[PDB]
Structure 1
């Protein structure tokens, strides 16, 4: 369930920053490992991105859509899906930081929709989430 993967990821990301969120564990565990590694490898770029998110209630949807479209423009791979999760999380953290916490539920929806609509076919073709665990899990 791609929704579950999103919800579990946002709860983990928000927890990292001291915030709670009211709304096969090995997939969730391997994703936490991968997003952590990605965030370390791209720490300073993520600092710049967050400083430039300029989140507003009526621009957030387009900001999300433009970044994720560009991200997967050249094709899909597991690293890009990991980057997708970490971007969404950085947006969720910035929404809470800017007293815009209602946007978190929206981001969770947008992420789940994209996963189910534009990423599921590639995931299923390249082995499923089990292949992600085989490649980068324990």
Structure 2
């Protein structure tokens, strides 16, 4: 079901963010970017969607690198407002899927959402992580990504990538 995949994306993305942030803390120690909002967000580690988001953060660690690097350098130029965040999110997310959908691109979108959320927090926009989550959920619903995931077996199919 496309709609149920779309509903599950919130928990997948929240779990992805938590574990990606924890992994960056483990890799960088005191040099990691601080964002307490990514430590305290709602989390259910044993749920299926919590397990999916975590596994995608893990497998993403050795595939995101070039795309993750350019996200950071580009975000240094992101203007401060919620409208600027939406416009930049939409441009980048659309470009990721211009040539079709695949799991690597899904993971790239989650990673982009993580980097966007981190950037806006570091530049003084607090309480915006739920809004980035909604950007991701709604984009995946209206851009047929939830439909593509549903035809692959749902988010649980992502566990096969590990």
Q: Where on the TM-score scale, by shorter chain, does this alignment land: which range?
A: 0.7 to 0.9
Partner of 2:70: 45
Count of aligned residue pairs for this structure pair = 136
Q: TM-score, normalised to structure 2's length? A: 0.72
Task: Say if 1:59 and 1:46 are closer, same or farther in 2 by CA, change over 3 A.
Answer: closer
* Higher deviation after alignment, 29-38 or 82-91: 29-38
Residue 93 (structure 1) shift: 0.4
Residue 122 (structure 1) shift: 0.3
Q: Note if contact 1:14-1:92 (Cα within 8 Å) is conserved in structure 2.
A: no
Q: 1:8 aligns with which of 15, 23, 41?
A: 15
Secondary structure at 1:60 match in 2:
helix
Residue 43 (structure 1) shift: 4.7
Q: Note if contact 2:35-2:122 (Cα within 8 Å) is conserved in structure 1.
A: no
Partner of 1:73: 98
Partner of 2:5: none
What is the alpha-carbon distance in structure 2 between the residues aligned to residue 50 and residue 69 of structure 1? Answer: 16
* Structure 1 residues 48-92: Cα deviation after superposition (integer angstroms, max 9, x where no partner): 222233343331111111111111111100011011001111000
Residue 104 (structure 1) shift: 2.0
What is the alpha-carbon distance in structure 2 between the residues aligned to residue 99 and residue 13 of structure 1? Answer: 21
